[PDB]
Structure formats: structure tokens, C-alpha cells
Symmetry: D5
Subunit: 94 residues, 10 copies
């Protein structure tokens, strides 16, 4: 099942610069795994913005929740989740 997921990142200014670097690296490694495995299907950045606009391909809401909750950035994210359906006019794969 497909979901459109928007994430806005607000890392705190008083965040320790050294922890910030560890967080950033952990986040990148985690999104790599998830893209390689296919759950994180598309990953784009809205032009001019931090954060991402993505499509996830997972088999349940619970799975999507666990993936998002697991992200190192989660405590600093604002997330919007929108289910996507097959469009009858679609030519090719969803």
C-alpha cells in the first residue's frame, strides 16, 4: 500500500553540535536501509526546504508507524501521512 508522507525537520538550535552530527549520520544510514529494502520507495526534497516529501510502500499502517517512529529524526519531525489509492486512469504500475 502506498502513502504520501511529508516530513518537516526542526532540529533544536541548542542541540549539541556533536550529537547533531551523530543524529544526521544515523538518519542517513536508516533511510538508506529503508530505500534499499523498498519500504521507502521515493524520497524527494521540496525545493527551498529542509526535510522531505516521500512515498512509502508498506503492508500496513502499523508497519509505517513503526518505521517512522524508528527514525533518528522522529523527535524533531512534523509528519503528515496521506494514503494513496490506485487511480483508474493510471497507465502502468501504481
Amino acid at each position: 500500500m502506498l502513502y504520501l508522507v511529508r516530513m518537516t525537520v526542526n532540529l533544536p538550535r541548542n542541540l549539541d553540535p556533536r550529537e547533531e552530527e551523530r543524529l544526521k549520520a544515523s538518519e542517513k544510514a536508516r533511510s538508506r536501509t529503508l530505500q534499499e529494502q523498498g519500504q521507502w520507495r521515493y524520497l524527494w526534497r521540496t525545493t527551498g526546504k529542509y526535510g522531505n516529501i516521500s512515498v512509502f510502500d508498506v503492508n500496513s499502517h502499523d508497519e509505517l508507524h513503526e518505521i517512522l517512529w524508528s527514525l533518528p529524526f522522529f523527535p524533531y519531525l512534523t509528519i503528515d501521512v496521506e494514503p494513496l489509492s490506485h487511480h483508474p486512469a493510471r497507465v502502468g504500475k501504481d
Copy 2:
């Protein structure tokens, strides 16, 4: 380049049914052509709603504008256009 495009459809209440069925057919035919040609890259239906969420891959704003203005549904659409950029953490193709 990539654009995330949301469209919501509000067809007039007083549309003659013979016109409405042919308008829907022409819209579907036009989106088919655009998907086949590659400009309309992804097309999804907003779950529970008469609209679509799409990704267009076109070479200019003017090209996207002309494509949207061309749609049979255009006079009845509410459209939001968001430019998408490459995410540095992307694994694979944009």
C-alpha cells in the same frame, strides 16, 4: 524536472449527463497520452476523494502550465503545484 501536483475535481451539478460522461472519457484519454509519453510520471487517487496526486516530469514551468490548461477537466480543477528537488540521501533514481 519533477513537480508534485494535487488536483481536486468539482464538476458542475448542472452538467448534462451526456456531456459529463464524454468529458470524463476525454480526460481519461488525455491523461493516458500524457502518461504514455512520460510527462505524467505518477498518478494516484486521493483515497476517499475525487482528485489526484501526481508527479509530472517536464522541462519547464510553461510546459507544465500548457499541459494542465489542456486538460478537459481544467475549468473544474483546483490545482496545487510544488517543485521537487533531489534529496541528498536518495538511494537510486529521483
Copy 3:
């Protein structure tokens, strides 16, 4: 899996009263079938308003979409859909 679904009903003021009564009877019959078959899991009235707050239990976004699209009231509904996940603190049935 579960979805929280809000629906608000806006029937046209010019609706033939006989057609309005037929439409309402059709809507009520359709929601009965969907509740008996288990997809329409919970159904409440929004106090003071002509609408409902519901919980649907289906196997895909597409299933939910087809169900909502099929409702006799669909052309007159404003619908919001939100996925729900199992809460780790839940004691009892979902």
C-alpha cells in the same frame, strides 16, 4: 487495518423531496450492509451536525476508496481519511 473517517453531508437545497427520501433510504441500506459485513466497524453522529465519524476496517486503501466512492451520498460528502495504528497501551479490542 483501520481508518478514522469523517463525513459531512451537503444535500442540494433543490433536491426533489421524493428523490431525497429515496437517496437517504439507499444510503442507510448501504451502510447497513457494510456494517454487517464488518468493513464499517464503528459509526457515530457528529453531535449538532449532519455527518458522521466512522472507523473503517479494510484490507487496503483501495478497498476503502471503492467503498466510499460507492456510497449513495458520495457526490454530496466532504470526507477526511486518517489511518489508525494499534496503540501499544491498548487494553481490549480495536
Copy 4:
């Protein structure tokens, strides 16, 4: 009487880790008792968010207020409360 209640949780970043862990266990024990007793009728996780959607079954607005005010998380919650009425098309339990 039933109420739909949305809660979003924003724990302070400067929360002492032992304070936080015990706050989390206290919250879970409290929601457990309220669910066992029936006042907290349904509880779901908002997919992708630190929060919940709940249905409470209590005898008065005052009873609901006291329950919410008493939750360990209350000082860190954003709460929305909406009364629910019995829907005439309901087949099955509320």
C-alpha cells in the same frame, strides 16, 4: 455518553531521562485502569505521530475533564474533545 478525543504529546527535550521513563510508565498504568474500567472505551495510535485518537464513555463533561486533567501526560498534551451521538443508521455497538 461518548466523546472523540484527540491527544498529541510533546514531552520537553530537557526532561530528565529518569523523570521521562517514570512518566511514561505512570501514563500507561493510568490508561490501563481507565480502559479496564470502561471509561476509556477505544484507544488508537495516530499513524506517524506521537498521539492518540480515543473514545471515552463517561457520565458527564465534568467526569471527562477530571480524567484528562489527571493523566500523567496532561501538562504535555494538546487535546481536542468532540461529543459523539448515536447514529440512527448504526447496526451494532457504539
Copy 5:
């Protein structure tokens, strides 16, 4: 139980004038009985607006729903409902 209820009225421009007079009289008669009985506890008009801001006192959500749905104006109202609780500092 108390509820704060806001109502905004939008009567259609194409309402038959006689029908509009009758509707207004029916609405006023209905709010009169509900206020006399106590369920419609307070009724104010928002300054500058064709609406009301009210407090209802009823025994359940279902009772309030039936009362609101019963109003002659219901098809033309935008309604917001908010539960009110006793304030511990109330004197």
C-alpha cells in the same frame, strides 16, 4: 450538562418571502419554548452578525443533537458545539 454552541445563519436569497416570514416565526417560537423549559440556557447575538452564541443545558449529547436538528433553521445553520465543564474557581 452544559455546551457552548455557535450558530451562523445563511438563509437562501431565493427563499419565498412568505416562507421566510413563516420560518423566522417558527424558529423564534421554538427558541422561546426551549428557553422557557431551560434547555436553551443563554442566548446572545454576536455583535455585527446574524447568528447566535448560546449555552445549552441538557442531559446527554443525544438530547442536544435532537434539539438542534429540530430547529426550523437547522438546514441553514453552521453549528459549532463545545462541551463546558464546571470551573473550580467559579463563584
Copy 6:
């Protein structure tokens, strides 16, 4: 003349317990005084929230501003003020 006033409270997290309780005590005392004198005509708690919905009965906007300013909570309140007029269909007290 009558005003509907909504207040939401956001106390600082960094208050010593003694200063927090003193603040809450001063607030309660101030609201008691205004209620006894009649300027604070009605006072209700928003179910599930730390705030109030109130009706003030005062002789000028200037008087209302000074009253609201004078509340110990003022520096921590979000306030909305709405003038109320006598309703021609009213039967009973304002």
C-alpha cells in the same frame, strides 16, 4: 456590556513549585474578586483543557483591558475577545 472571552493558559515549565502555587493562588483570588463584584459574570472550564470560556460584564473596552491585564495569569494567556449583543429572541437573563 457583554464580552465572550476565551483564555488558554501556558505556564512556564521552569517555575519553582512555590512560585507556581502562589501564581495559581493569586489567580484564583483575583477571579473570585471579579466574580463577586459581577464583572466576571460567567466562568466555565473548557472540557479537557487548561483554560476558560467566560462572559465579562463591564462598562468599556478600556475597563475590560485593565481587568484582563490585571490577572496574575495574563503574561501566560492567549486571549480571544468577542463583543456580545442582546438577542431579540432572548427569554430570560443575559
Copy 7:
């Protein structure tokens, strides 16, 4: 008592032309009176829009309400009302 009042005007497209010119003349005459009295204290037009942004100067909310309800345009107006208080830094 001072109030900041915003009004946006939406006349029906199907208004009889004669009736519409009459309504406009009645509105202008009514605002003239209220301005002469000082109750409609300031009257401006938001640049680019059909309506007004105004300050009213009246004794009570109820008086303001009757004034607004009285306007020939009232059925076609969207109105926002905000109370204004004396500012301690005001000079004059």
C-alpha cells in the same frame, strides 16, 4: 467605545440594475448620516477591494449592532468586529 470594523461587499450578480443603484444610493446616504454624527468615525477602502475598513465610535455593543444591521448593504456584507482600547503610549 471604539471598534475596528471590516466589511466586504458581495452584491448578487442577479440584482436588478435599478434596484442596485438605489441600494448603493441608500447605503451612501446612511453612511453619510453616521459619519456626520461621529458614530462612523473613520471610513477607508482597502486598496484593490470592494468594501471598507472602518472605526466606529459608539456607546455600546448593542448600539453598534443596530447600526450595522440597519445598513442597506447588511444582507450582502461579511463583517468582522474588533474592540479597540486606549493605548497608554498614545499622544493627543
Copy 8:
């Protein structure tokens, strides 16, 4: 030319008492000068809130900008600026 200006004030919670005092004093002195000179034409308090609604009378957008930027409170203000035009019904 006239402008309707809304200002909402959010002073830092960490300001020194003495420093905040001086800052408020500087703000009040600046608004006094601007009102005496006529550029700050009207100044009202938004009832119940720490803000103001103002009308400015200046000769260009650039002049208004320089005036607002100069306010001691500027870093702590949220400002909305609306150009006002002469109303044909103004007496």
C-alpha cells in the same frame, strides 16, 4: 498615504528587568516622536492583547519601512501592513 498596521509584541522572557524597562521606555519615546511629527497618525490597543492597531501617514513604502525598522521593539514584533485608499463615501 495611509496604512493600517497591526503589531503584536513578543518580548524575550530572558530580558533583564532593567534592560526591559529601558527598552520599553525607548519604544514609548520613539512612538511619541513619530506621533508628534504626524507619521504615526492613530495608535490603539488591541483590547485584551499586547499589541497595537495603528494608522501611519507617510509619503512612500520605503519611508514606512524605515520607520518600522527603527522601532526599538522591531526584532520582537509581528507586523501586518495594509494600504488604505480614500473611500468615495467618506464625508
Copy 9:
């Protein structure tokens, strides 16, 4: 002085076709004159929309008001106006 002006066009669906043609021709001729004279300094279309986003250069708010009020499309426009100032970092023309 300069103003950013956004305009969205909503022509009635019940316009006689000749009237609509004349209206469009009149609008285009009026915007031509204003651009040639310099009051309408810049004119762009928001991609995907029937409107424009423009910069006007006029000597007063009243002058802008009269120009906008003059437009044949005025009754069908939603307009937003915001003042622009010379930016101290600008290199090149305004």
C-alpha cells in the same frame, strides 16, 4: 512605488459567449495600455492557474485602487495587494 498584486479570475459560467469574448478582449487591451505606460511593471501567470501575479508601479494607493477598479475583469477577481520597498542589497533595477 511598488506593489505585489495577485489576481485570481473567476468568470461566471453563464456569460453569453460574445460578451465573454468582448470582456477578454477589453481586459487584454487595458493591461496592454498599463504595461506600455509602465504602471503595470511586471506580469506573470502562476503555473497551473488562471490568474496573474504582478508588480505595479504607481504614485499612490489611490492610483493603484483606481487602476484595479478600472479593469474589465474587476468584478470577477480575487485580489491581494502588498507593498514592496527598495531592498538595500538590490543590484540592478526594481
Copy 10:
């Protein structure tokens, strides 16, 4: 490709005068270069606010994104990006 870009600036309250002076200087120098090279086509101040309205002229969304990310002010900016198209009624340069 033209883009309309709004930026609002929120500099940290704790920057000392020399930090602030240097950051502003760096931002000004960066915008100078971008204007000289033609990517930053128009630049105006938002009257009464610490911000700007700009028109950028670049060959891809990614080019704009890298330019915005490169600004000294970027961590402190709120940015909105809107694609612009050529308007059929335009007389003059874009």
C-alpha cells in the same frame, strides 16, 4: 524558469553584534553575486518586515534549491517557492 520566492528572516536572538554584522555582510555579498550572474533576477523588501520577495531565473529546481541552501541566512529563513509562467498578455520583459 522563473520562480517567485518569499523569504522571512528570523535571526537568533543570541547573535552578538559582530556575529550579526558579519552574517549580514556575507548574505549581502552572496546576493550580489547571484544578482550579477543573473540567477537572482528581482529582489524587493517586504515593507515593514525582515524579509524579501524575489524572482529567481534558473535552469532547474535543483539549481534553485542549491542556491537557496547556499545562502548565509538559510538556517534562519522561512521560504515559499512558486513557479511562474509566461503570461499571454505580457508586453515587456519577464
